């Protein structure tokens, strides 16, 4: 029943500051270590550091010490990860993960958060434009947005089988674009309602689009 819910994706210009927060429920928050894992684009996992929220004792990797701050507010079951000035190379996905202990104890990260996508760019945020892919297979074309990521669902998550959301491609315009499709029986094209729910946190934009055949 333990679940960690991290804050939404963000976009910041280089030099700016940033605090990302993970909210923890399900267990005694002040009893177990919590850590931050960093994953650069197309790269493996990096162990950044951990904090015991009980006494705010922190243990960094030497590669992040003085570059980043790990803190915790045990009054609201929340941990934080903070930068003074963001570098371009700080662009990554940042995971929050409880470091449980097992019977010089045996430490391991058993529970993880969904993650927080951080994009460091001088480019300004753009919300997406959503067009229908009229049909059997049907979909939604999400175009001209910045920066990653968007998330697409169908019928508020009620439609999962046969859904395929493609990795975004970077158009020459410097904007992203991706499509999400689903396959459904051709008999349901006139009897069922198909809506894609596109969600772009960096632009505070959420789009619902109903797809109809031509």
């Amino acid at each position: 029943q333990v679940q960690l819910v991290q804050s939404g994706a963000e976009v910041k210009k280089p030099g700016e500051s940033l605090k990302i927060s993970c909210k923890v429920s399900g267990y005694n928050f002040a009893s177990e270590w919590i850590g931050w894992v960093r994953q650069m684009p197309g790269k493996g996992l990096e162990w950044m550091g951990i904090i015991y929220p009980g006494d705010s004792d922190t243990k960094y990797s030497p590669s992040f010490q003085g570059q980043v701050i790990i803190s915790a507010d045990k009054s609201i079951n929340t941990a934080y990860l903070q930068w003074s000035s963001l570098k371009a190379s700080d662009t990554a996905i940042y995971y929050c993960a409880r470091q449980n202990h097992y019977g010089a104890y045996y430490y391991a990260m058993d529970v993880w958060g969904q993650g927080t996508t951080v994009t460091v760019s001088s480019a300004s945020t753009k919300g997406p434009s959503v067009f229908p892919l009229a049909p059997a297979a049907l979909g939604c074309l999400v175009k001209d947005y910045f920066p990653e990521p968007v998330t697409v669902s169908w019928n508020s998550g009620a439609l999962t089988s046969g859904v395929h959301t493609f990795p975004a491609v970077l158009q020459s315009s410097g904007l992203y674009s991706l499509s999400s499709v689903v396959t459904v029986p051709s008999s349901s094209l006139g009897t069922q309602t198909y809506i894609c729910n596109v969600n772009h946190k960096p632009s505070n934009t959420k789009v619902d689009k109903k797809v109809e055949p031509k």
Binding site: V37, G44, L45, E46, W47, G49, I50, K59, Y60, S61, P62, S63, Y95, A97, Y102, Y106, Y107, A108, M109, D110, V111, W112, G113, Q114, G115, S129, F131, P132, L133, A134, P135, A137, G139, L141, K143, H164, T165, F166, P167, A168, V169, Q171, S177, L178, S179, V181, T183, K214
Partner: protein
């Protein structure tokens, strides 16, 4: 600072195969080692802690062993949902460095792409641009060739499906409204080894 190496960096095996991945530390770490599984677009999952101790909820086909410098992760019977990236981690001393990771793909029978095509929306046209999409659904292997002929494109490809181990590809042909209005027939040709002959899916403007 402890360094970790895993081998192989990537492997492909068919359903039912026995697969072993190895982790090697720069120093002796006894049994202080963990294994994690990360499926594409998802957050990582604890599989094994203390070198051999299986995490609750994890399927019995996963097993781990080793001590000192060399550890192994073993999947007794590969499932199609087991196609994921696998990391090791040392829990002896901070920092708790991870391993480089190993990509595990799945080998299946050759499947041919179901090919669809979507003409641009009338809403999109009034915005200035025109994007034509060709979709290749549930095929294998990942290699495939798409060509747009009318008589400036971009492709994307999903990861291996966790249920049927197939891939899926999209190709988006993008023009300006002016250039789109100047031609009649749009078609995508698809060559694949599961296809005995090239498949062409086309449309004429207007319906």
């Amino acid at each position: 600072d402890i360094q970790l190496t895993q081998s192989p960096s990537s492997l492909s095996a068919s359903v039912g195969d026995r697969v072993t991945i190895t982790c090697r530390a720069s120093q002796s770490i006894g049994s202080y080692l963990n294994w994690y599984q990360q499926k594409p677009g998802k957050a990582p999952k604890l599989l094994i802690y203390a070198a051999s101790t299986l995490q609750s909820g994890v399927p019995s086909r996963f097993s781990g062993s080793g001590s000192g410098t060399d550890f192994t992760l073993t999947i007794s019977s590969l499932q199609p949902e087991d196609s994921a990236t696998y990391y090791c981690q040392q829990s002896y001393s901070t920092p708790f460095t991870f391993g480089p990771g190993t990509k595990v793909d799945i080998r299946r029978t050759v499947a041919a792409p179901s090919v669809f095509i979507f003409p641009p929306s009338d809403e999109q046209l009034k915005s200035g641009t025109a994007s034509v999409v060709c979709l290749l659904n549930n095929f294998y292997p990942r290699e495939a060739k798409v060509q747009w002929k009318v008589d400036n494109s971009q492709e994307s490809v999903t990861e291996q499906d966790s249920k049927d181990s197939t891939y899926s590809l999209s190709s988006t042909l993008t023009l300006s409204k002016a250039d789109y209005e100047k031609h009649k027939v749009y078609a995508c040709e698809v060559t694949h080894q599961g296809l005995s002959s090239p498949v062409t899916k086309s449309f004429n403007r207007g319906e």
